[PDB]
Design an enzyme around this catalytic site. Sequence first.
Site, PDB file in Angstrom:
ATOM      1  N   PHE A  81    -105.610   5.385   5.446  1.00 50.70           N
ATOM      2  CA  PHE A  81    -105.629   4.107   4.710  1.00 50.70           C
ATOM      3  C   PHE A  81    -106.550   4.235   3.497  1.00 50.70           C
ATOM      4  N   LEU A  86    -104.891   6.286   0.816  1.00 53.23           N
ATOM      5  CA  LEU A  86    -103.775   5.538   0.195  1.00 53.23           C
ATOM      6  C   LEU A  86    -104.334   4.477  -0.745  1.00 53.23           C
ATOM      7  N   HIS A  87    -105.488   3.912  -0.420  1.00 50.54           N
ATOM      8  CA  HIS A  87    -106.054   2.828  -1.251  1.00 50.54           C
ATOM      9  C   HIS A  87    -106.246   3.322  -2.681  1.00 50.54           C
ATOM     10  N   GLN A  88    -106.862   4.488  -2.839  1.00 50.32           N
ATOM     11  CA  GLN A  88    -107.082   5.028  -4.207  1.00 50.32           C
ATOM     12  C   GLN A  88    -105.765   5.482  -4.829  1.00 50.32           C
ATOM     13  N   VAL A 114    -103.978   1.516  -5.888  1.00 53.35           N
ATOM     14  CA  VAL A 114    -104.657   0.632  -6.868  1.00 53.35           C
ATOM     15  C   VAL A 114    -104.826   1.383  -8.184  1.00 53.35           C
TER      16      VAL A 114
END
Lengths: 187, 290
Positions: free
Chosen positions: A25, A28-30, A33
Amino acid sequence: MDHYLDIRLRPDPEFPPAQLMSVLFGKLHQALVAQGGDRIGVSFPDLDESRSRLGERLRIHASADDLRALLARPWLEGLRDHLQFGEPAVVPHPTPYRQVSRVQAKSNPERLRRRLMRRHDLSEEEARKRIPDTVARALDLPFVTLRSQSTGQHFRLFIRHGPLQVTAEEGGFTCYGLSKGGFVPWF
Amino acid sequence: LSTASVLAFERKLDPSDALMSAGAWAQRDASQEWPAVTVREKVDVANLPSDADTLKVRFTLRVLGGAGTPSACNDAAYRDKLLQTVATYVNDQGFAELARRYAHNLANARFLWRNRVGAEAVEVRINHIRQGEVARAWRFDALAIGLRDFKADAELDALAELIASGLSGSGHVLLEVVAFARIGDGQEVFPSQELKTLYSVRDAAAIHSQKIGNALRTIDTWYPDEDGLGPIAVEPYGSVTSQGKAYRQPKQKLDFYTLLDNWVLRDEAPAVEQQHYVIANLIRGGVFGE
């Protein structure tokens, strides 16, 4: 979301399921966004309240062009060794209404007393008496263990799952995948 | 001809602690003088230097040999039978399979537990130190090399041959492994937690010798049932801490103790997979009998 991407976390002995999901997670966040895009959202298809887990797989609901660059991005890729990832597949026409959101609150009275005393310039006793024992509240839902610069040990992740509804209102989602006020395709 | 109440086998392929430092990919050509990462408090946390985007890990490895040779045995008959079975197995087929698996494990980053997570480029360099001189070096890529797939390579075959020779007792073997992983500036490393106290030697972070040798010995790939997890650290009863499940239960015939007892008392040679698992356990060493 015209293209759904299902990332299934493969079991690995080197890492545990909680740590594996947390790392996936975070990575995937970087990869989303920073990558941009009008609507970026993911849901936990394996979410179960019995085990209090976050699920063994995730489904990212996005457009075709958005996923074309998202999967192609090196940051979102490279973890195929520990995670089994496929290609975009058209989601089924029937979909439910669910909105996943995050709760932001502080469970420590000291942080609240400090934030209050740092605005009106109050005293230590003034800030302490103004913060009672009834101001400590936190979500009791399942929270995955995430260890980062925020906390040395495993930090809880507050994830709120929206109840199943009939009407599904779509729209632009947040940069980090937070609820933008609308449900997402459930299938 | 019963077993010996006291049985012990010294471990083989025992590495040492792994020192850690930080630097830049440009300095990879000359790693000398790389500043070390010192543990700090915030619990205890360790972060790379202010300007450092690559982590470095350096650890040595020795090959003693005589895996089948028992260290202590109460009965002479049992020791002779074991040595005979070992010689027969070696004659029939060599350890080249175990050596190849070990070479792949060393080449890839399977050893790193948390450092590998979020690594864009991991470059491993395995040198060979003989008589104090670097006889031959090797450089691989953990990312390029498949983690769940084993591929053949000239360097991997040469390393497997060297390991097989060392284990057979041809000559002393020393391999200095140095890995460089790109994580990012100001990232947070995950050193081995101590009983929050982070393991540090000489005011420098490192990983436990046993903690490294545990991953390095991930040669157990003949389990009865496979769910796609991959290699599991060789352990008795196929126990797994993270998964919380123990494969190769004693009820089945794949158990290490049962296989060895049968192949010793009844001279029943099990499947090549079981024989490989048994040889791996004997190489790892331990305490058996009573």
